């Protein structure tokens, strides 16, 4: 047909002019020189494009067709802009804490994923009772998230300049505190998951390990790694604001979950709570 010839000639002409533009751009000296001028600003471009890729994958996951790679990508983007970026912009350079705590977050997110591949067939959601999962109004969730970021960025900014923090024997505290929070979180998750049949359907009351020191050790361990990042950069006020916002939201969510298991288990969780009152901090809260 002649129309095929006409459209092929049109495509050839468009390809010819596009390749002419491409060839005169490739051999252009000023284009390459300005390319090298904008080569100066490379680490901030990946840090911002990962935000776009993350929000795209996050909208897809909100729709519900996200592969596990996109979910871990959202996790990685959050961990990069919460533990790699705050001292990459407010100091201009990374050395010391940010890489360690960025990998520490990736290490700390990976127990509910690791345990639920080991003591399961896969990550496939088992059919369960709809009132078992704790749900909270979305404005409260985003308020908690915003407060957490405000605390972390405030620790980054109020904290001093990067390479001036000391070393030697003063950097053993973050080591032991991080070991403690990982150990206590792992114990809490293991003791919570070794009894439940489904994803969150407990059968008996857990009163072993950190549960005999505190009523909510998972939340307090997340709290303690928050404090660990904030203490690695030696900023008390942002630690206090982080403590305030996490106390508010975690206490709200702990109150709903506590009244749920009080209603569901009867006297058992009541005597468990009488044995250990302190909800978040040992003999402080």
């Amino acid at each position: 047909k002649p129309m095929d010839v006409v459209k092929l000639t049109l495509l050839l002409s468009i390809l010819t002019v596009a390749a002419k533009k491409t060839l005169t751009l490739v051999l252009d000296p000023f284009f390459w020189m300005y390319f090298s001028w904008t080569w100066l600003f490379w680490p901030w471009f990946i840090a911002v494009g990962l935000a776009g890729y993350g929000i795209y994958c996050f909208r897809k996951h909100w729709l519900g067709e996200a592969n596990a790679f996109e979910q871990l990508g959202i996790v990685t983007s959050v961990f990069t802009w919460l533990t790699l970026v705050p001292p990459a912009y407010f100091n201009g350079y990374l050395e010391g804490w940010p890489y360690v705590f960025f990998l520490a977050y990736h290490y700390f997110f990976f127990f509910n994923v690791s345990v639920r591949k080991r003591l399961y067939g896969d990550f496939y959601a088992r059919t369960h009772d709809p009132k078992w999962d704790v749900n909270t109004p979305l404005w409260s969730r985003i308020l908690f998230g915003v407060g957490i970021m405000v605390g972390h960025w405030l620790a980054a900014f109020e904290g001093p300049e990067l390479h001036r923090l000391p070393g030697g024997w003063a950097n053993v505290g973050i080591w032991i505190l991080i070991v403690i929070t990982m150990l206590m979180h792992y114990d809490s998750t293991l003791y919570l998951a070794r009894y439940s049949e489904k994803v969150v359907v407990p059968t008996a009351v857990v009163q072993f390990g950190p549960y005999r020191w505190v009523r909510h050790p998972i939340y307090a361990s997340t709290m303690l790694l928050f404090a660990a990042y904030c203490t690695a950069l030696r900023a008390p006020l942002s630690l206090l604001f982080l403590l305030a916002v996490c106390l508010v939201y975690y206490n709200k969510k702990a109150k709903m979950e506590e009244e749920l298991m009080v209603e569901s288990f009867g006297q058992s969780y009541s005597d468990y709570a009488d044995k250990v009152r302190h909800k978040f901090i040992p003999f402080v809260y």
């Binding site: 290490y107 345990v115 150990l183 792992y186």
Partner: protein, 49 residues
């Protein structure tokens, strides 16, 4: 008859994903690989402590 050579080759391959006995370099390779495997797994990391 060339299939017998491949049979012996991949049977030796099967044997070297075991610890019957062989040269020392491969044993050191498997030992450092097993150390890496133990170290990377967190549920295998905690039981070391």
């Amino acid at each position: 008859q060339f299939k017998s050579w491949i049979f012996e080759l991949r049977e030796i391959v099967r044997e070297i994903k075991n610890a019957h006995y062989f040269l020392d370099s491969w044993t050191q390779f498997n030992s450092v690989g097993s150390f890496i495997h133990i170290f990377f797994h967190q549920e295998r990391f905690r039981k070391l402590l």
